[PDB]
From Swiss-Prot:
Gene name tied to this protein: LYZ
Taxonomy of the source species: Eukaryota, Metazoa, Chordata, Craniata, Vertebrata
InterPro entries associated with the record: Glyco_hydro_22, Glyco_hydro_22_CS, Glyco_hydro_22_lys, Lysozyme-like_dom_sf
Tissue-by-tissue expression: In the egg white and polymorphonuclear leukocytes.
A GO term from the CC aspect: extracellular space
Entry's Gene Ontology molecular function annotations: beta-N-acetylglucosaminidase activity; identical protein binding; lysozyme activity
Protein name per its UniProtKB record: Lysozyme C
Domain C-type lysozyme: 1-129
């Protein structure tokens, strides 16, 4: 599922991401944009052999099990495939754990490099929320 900008904003708000750990809704939409182009099926392998999954590109090294990242963890206690669903509940719930681990949204490189310090509110402008 490829989300619309406002469709995704609505979904994230409904799942309680707006100002979660102090991150306004626009941060999350900006992050999803540059991480996955709003595409729940997005996947990307990285150097250590781990894989990033879903609309928020959650990594198998720590957060989910994909059966092919030896010595990794599964801190969200989910199969990584669950992160590829059209329903973002799994991704959002897992994201909540990640942004809570002490490093905030810096855990998402795309957010750090492309959303942080920008006018992130622009990402939810015009949306019925
Ligand atoms: Cl991540």
């Amino acid at each position: 599922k490829v989300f619309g900008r406002c469709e995704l904003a609505a979904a994230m708000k409904r799942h309680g991401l707006d100002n979660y750990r102090g991150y306004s809704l626009g941060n999350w939409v900006c992050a999803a944009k540059f991480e996955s182009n709003f595409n729940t099926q997005a996947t990307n392998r990285n150097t250590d052999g781990s894989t990033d999954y879903g609309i928020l590109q959650i990594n198998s090294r720590w957060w989910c099990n994909d059966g092919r990242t030896p010595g990794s963890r599964n801190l969200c206690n989910i199969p990584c495939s669950a992160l590829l669903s059209s329903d973002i509940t799994a991704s959002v719930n897992c994201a909540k754990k990640i942004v809570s681990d002490g490093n905030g949204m810096n855990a998402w490189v795309a957010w750090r490099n492309r959303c942080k310090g920008t006018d992130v509110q622009a990402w939810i402008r015009g949306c019925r929320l």
